[PDB]
Design a protein around this ligand. Structure first.
Ligand SMILES: Nc1ncnc2c1ncn2[C@@H]1O[C@H](COP(=O)(O)OP(=O)(O)OP(=O)(O)O)[C@@H](O)[C@H]1O
Ligand SMILES: Nc1ncnc2c1ncn2[C@@H]1O[C@H](COP(=O)(O)OP(=O)(O)OP(=O)(O)O)[C@@H](O)[C@H]1O
Lengths: 734, 735
């Protein structure tokens, strides 16, 4: 009458060897399945088309019905999660026979021979020899200690029913305390014809480091050393929040911490727990939390927190609402005194979630994962080539650097899709052209990867912070004094915060950039961000503007919080002369409110010493008098049009592709003639000259002086001395 | 106590001979439960379409599971039994009376099989349970001449008392070793239409979409026929195929086409029919269906109308069935096996209708888009449909087909079938009304009925964002070669200079501006570029993009830009920029300013679009903000002023082609010289009104006189003033 429907796994205690197929099952469950205890058992493991045949035994009536024993060896073989949902069914037909069985000798160079001493008997002592191959701990093997394990992936036995997946094998050996035609062979990875499930490993995870070690420490302190942390009495945290842009790495991290942990875990299925009646949901959450704190080793996983816990202030949806948030808060407030419980919550956007009450008291650990930079993307591509192995492709390292540099706005989720699409379109190209040629010779090249990155069309370009392409000082066309000025401005806070703490002077934290719209106002920010090596946030003027009232204020507050969380860094605004005006040009009250809020955040009733505020403007009249006050944005840079040296450097950089000797230009007369232009204007004139050189006979190895003269006469400067005089007058009065 | 309810099909293995028509591998327990003699005929009704296709039954060797049955690939293909359908078995019927004629058909062949025949009659009619509605047999080996030959046995002249049986199985009585009823070799046509049996759909049924069908083929039978090919890489084979497009195109038609052309196991669903009041019941049903599908290694699952069961989840919510089913589907499709050989096919109406969460590049990277057909595809589909009706039903020449294709602009395959049906019914009605029940073959298909058909069809696809602008040849193009050379160079530089630009780094200007008089040379320029370019053209009108809802134009232009980017290097055109441009002067709403900022950031902000080329044609250029009027974007400027004497003369001689020049007596030069201040549209209007003035005298005229031309010329005025031309010249000089 018990009617058991759901089952969960549990580690086998006391270690040792035992059955090595324990299957401690309550006698009531034994009678419920209408199968004698002296027979095999099957685990449904809900889905995945995975059925296992394993010998079954009985428990001592103390073992609870809810949890079952399956042995860590079988759990590792079948990738059974320590906490996944399981079922029970009737046993299937016995396997026919086993033929070869061969050791694998993973995570090592193999070549043991002498210290082997008939491992076959110990490996096959258990009746549960399986096709995927059992995994055993080192235990004790003569001298040398160390850890060695072998797997039985490869064999030559076939079973008629294709429904059965693990298709266990039996043993029949002669000995005390020789298989069939030897068994020791192979030293490579697992068999690929059977394609054993190998989802992840720590060797694979390398994209993020500064976050992965931080979160590893955060999750290991409450569990591995609970008494040491609880001795102080500050209580152990029970909440970890993971957030980031879509496509980043959070699901791999939760899967890794689930797989690498031999302790019990609790993973929910998402919004499926929501039912028509709230009573069923309440009972389910009560039961899962009871299972959680009943056993000391337990980890709780929550995914899609926003869907489970919608914001209360955003909308009054009803039904599933903040009541479940309150009941879970009461649950995690008092599970025990010290305990060992860690909860991982990964959400796409904390804004959708309600952080109004979460941040103050229930948790104080922040985990932020951003889009990979050049180094992280390069590392991910390198690891991709690593587990792809060179037996299937060849590509040089500088090609890897080129691909990493080209891929800037891509997300971590995009690279695997790029690899898969490259593989499929390369093989379809081979089928179309070479007419079913061997795939080994075709392998992977560079042109297919280039086509894939051209035609992928990523959708992750839209984001709150713009990661501008990295440029070095070579691309900067300017003067040495300006470079020294920005070097001083970016070096004073980071290298003098400790000095200012004792001095009590801090820094102005304000830089204003005004000048011609030609150049030296946007690319210089990228160059300084690249050279400093600090986090850089770039947002445009109209980009933050929104039709809804207060959306711009919310975005500004969010970016300010991100800058605060991202350590002392520099924040830059691309275009300020559209939001700055309040009286010169007509505007709505939202602009005035935003201006007041940003002024208060900069220099009102609080001081943001860590961050540095730098802004660029095109017309100085739009800046309000309140913002244009001493103590805020006091520093001003003329940053006028590039001089002869800067224009000459830009021309030399742009002429690198062409041949200067063949052209015959001295690179000085052109610079002298081109005196009233700007860096962007110089680039446009160079492009026009190249076009005028290439319409003659398509590709050209050099550009003639006639093309340069035609380009120069075709395009006008478009700049008047009146604006320069106005800028000089503004500079003089300031 | 087994209580069998449902059965499914599976191809007969081991080849051999066996029964080859009446295998019927069913467990003896099922036969005993039905109280039916195993040595007798079996009747499986497959739910619906009565006739039950009576077939003789036999027994298995106790290794055939009850849930699956066999009825031979020949009968499966003839009776439209797709591999993986629903089969329902019931009690046997009465014995067949007799077979009378049976006649071969020689499908997909020229017949004349007497040389390699070698008594085909024995090999066909010796097998038990031969049924008239069709036998298909593999070539095997018939002496020399190899190749493959097949026959059609559908036609017969036998009548059965019960009309319910549409398959009317008949017995056989042969006399030979290793003679019919008065020979059997006759005719060369297709199966008789009076049987009205369903016919399989092949790749000849589809046309005009060769690249899309070839790509989706390659993509669908690279996994299935070569699982080891994808297993070798180890990066797992993708299982995401998305069918999205306007309704009535035929992606679902092609879905059943590729289902029929593949002999592997397939599955079909009704969509929201699985949804029930119990979530657990639906989960159990779907998991059981998926387990049955994955029980056999070769299997295909088809999903149709996914938006109902896959909410976007980006906005609002609902209840009962929600994104939980999407999550469980994702979990089950992420873990059937590392390599596997089972793919998932999904069909949807709108790209945003399907769940964006379901759209993951890791698993759903392949997407195929089926747009509305162009003139070439419309001509191809009309031609193949006309060949399907064949020359006996109608006699239509290629000129009529191309005229109909040119006339049809927004029509789709569903519209084509609708107009075909409308023409048929209009012809029937006209014949009944006038000829008083005359023979229907004599009236056949004409032009008047089809004309009334697309006059009265009223298609519902007129309102759309994707417009296939009609193309015109270079003969109708009237202008000067000065602008023609410039536009040709601009549209030819990227296509054969992309690599040169990539090496040099210059890339492309990507900016073209066309400002001129409102008369002509804008729509004509768009037609000429769309014709000569040979690349997909997207036409967006000025007032069309404007909508009452705030932000409609925002993601409208976002979607059109995404489509242009993802549709290979192409060209994008905007009809009227002078309406969206005015913000400060026109005191437009904030939506227009937001759209302008968005497009300005899209064209040349924080990204580069080298593949696509932007061409802009506007009437009033003073409303464009100075931010857009910047070097590096839309820098190229074309005067494209009023047509000169040459273009006007060409237009006049084109319009005079309908009339007779010799009878008129005009030299085609004095009229052009007199009409100098007009424009192409003005010249066309003048020609039309001159023709009208010539025809109100005595109705139809074979020529137009000079007096009528003078009357038309002096009746109206050019309407063009020198001050606007001077202002345009001043703007050109200052820009
Ligand atoms: N560091 C990485 N290296 C390689 N591939 C990665 C990496 N990070 C993410 N991916 C790719 O992105 C896919 C999805 O990533 P993942 O599921 O971890 O993202 P998530 O942000 O947690 O998910 P969601 O979008 O549901 O919030 C992975 O299956 C993999 O293909
Ligand atoms: N390539 C084609 N070959 C033959 N018939 C076609 C073709 N394309 C469309 N049709 C015709 O279109 C008609 C209706 O097509 P249907 O509405 O099923 O198109 P679909 O785009 O696949 O469907 P939907 O978008 O509604 O799911 C049918 O009569 C069919 O014969």
């Amino acid at each position: 009458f018990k009617l058991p429907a759901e089952f969960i796994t549990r580690p086998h205690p006391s270690k040792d060897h035992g059955k090595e197929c324990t299957a401690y099952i309550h006698p009531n469950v034994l009678s419920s399945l209408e199968i004698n205890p002296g027979s095999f058992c099957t685990v449904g493991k809900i889905g995945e088309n995975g059925i296992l045949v394993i010998a079954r035994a009985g428990d001592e009536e103390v073992h609870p019905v809810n949890v079952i024993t399956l042995s860590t060896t079988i759990r590792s073989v079948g990738n059974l999660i320590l906490g996944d949902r399981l079922e029970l069914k009737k046993a299937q037909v016995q396997p026919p026979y086993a033929t070869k069985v061969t050791v694998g000798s993973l995570q090592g160079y193999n070549i043991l021979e002498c210290m082997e001493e008939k491992v076959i008997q110990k490996l096959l002592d258990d009746s549960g020899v399986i096709m995927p191959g059992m995994i055993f701990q080192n235990l004790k093997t003569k001298a040398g200690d160390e850890s060695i394990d072998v797997v039985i992936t490869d064999a030559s036995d076939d079973s008629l029913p294709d429904v059965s997946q693990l298709d266990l094998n039996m043993d029949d050996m002669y000995g005390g305390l020789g298989s069939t035609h030897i068994t020791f062979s192979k030293e490579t990875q697992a068999n690929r014809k059977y394609n054993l499930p190998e989802p992840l490993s720590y060797a694979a995870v390398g994209g993020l480091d500064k976050e992965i070690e931080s979160l590893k420490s955060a999750i290991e302190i409450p569990l591995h050393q609970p008494t040491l942390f609880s001795s102080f009495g500050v209580s152990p945290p029970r909440g970890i929040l993971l957030h980031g842009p879509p496509g980043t790495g959070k699901t791999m991290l939760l899967r890794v911490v689930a797989n690498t942990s031999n302790a019990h875990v609790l993973t929910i299925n998402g919004p499926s727990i929501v039912s028509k009646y709230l009573g069923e949901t309440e009972a389910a959450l009560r039961d899962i939390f009871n299972e959680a704190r009943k056993y000391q080793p337990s980890i709780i996983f929550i995914d899609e927190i926003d869907s489970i816990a919608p914001n209360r202030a955003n909308d009054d949806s009803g039904e599933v609402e903040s009541r479940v948030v309150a009941t879970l808060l009461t649950l995690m407030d008092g599970m025990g005194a010290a305990g060992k419980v860690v909860v991982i919550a990964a959400t796409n956007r904390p804004n959708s979630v309600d952080p109004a009450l979460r941040r103050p008291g229930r948790f104080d650990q922040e985990v932020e994962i951003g889009i990979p930079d050049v180094d992280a993307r390069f590392d991910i591509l390198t690891k991709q080539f690593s587990r792809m192995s060179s037996d299937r492709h060849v590509l040089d390292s500088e090609a890897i650097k080129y691909i990493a540099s080209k891929t800037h706005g891509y997300v971590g989720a995009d690279l695997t899709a790029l690899c898969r699409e490259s593989v499929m379109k390369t093989i379809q190209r081979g089928l179309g052209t070479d007419a079913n040629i061997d795939k080994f010779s075709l392998k992977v090249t560079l042109k297919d990867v280039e086509s894939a990155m051209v035609d992928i069309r990523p959708s992750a370009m839209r984001e709150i912070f713009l990661e501008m392409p990295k440029v070095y000082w070579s691309d900067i066309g300017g003067q040495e004094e300006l470079k020294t000025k920005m070097k001083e401005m970016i070096q004073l806070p980071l290298e003098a915060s400790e000095t200012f703490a004792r001095l009590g002077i801090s820094a102005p934290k304000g830089v204003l950039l005004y000048g011609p719209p030609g150049c030296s106002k946007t690319l210089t920010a990228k160059a300084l961000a690249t050279e400093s090596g600090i986090n850089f946030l770039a947002v445009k003027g109209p980009e933050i503007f929104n039709k809804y009232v207060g959306e711009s204020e919310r975005a500004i507050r969010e970016i300010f919080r991100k800058a605060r969380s991202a350590a002392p860094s520099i924040i830059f605004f691309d275009e300020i002369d559209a939001l700055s005006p309040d009286r010169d040009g007509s505007s709505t009250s939202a602009a005035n409110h935003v201006l007041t809020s940003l002024l208060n955040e900069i220099d009102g009733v609080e001081e943001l010493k860590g961050v540095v505020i730098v802004a660029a403007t095109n017309r100085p009249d739009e800046i309000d008098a309140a913002l244009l006050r001493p103590g805020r944005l006091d520093r001003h840079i003329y940053v006028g049009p590039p001089d002869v040296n800067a224009r000459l450097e830009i021309l030399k950089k742009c002429t690198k592709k062409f041949n200067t000797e063949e052209s015959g230009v001295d690179l000085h007369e052109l610079a002298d003639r081109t005196e009233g232009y700007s860096g962007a204007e110089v680039v446009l004139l160079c492009q026009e000259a190249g076009l005028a050189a290439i319409m003659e006979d398509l590709d050209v190895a050099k550009v003639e002086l006639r093309h340069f003269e035609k380009a120069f006469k075709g395009i006008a400067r478009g700049i008047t001395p009146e604006m320069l005089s106005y800028y000089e007058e503004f500079a003089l009065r300031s």
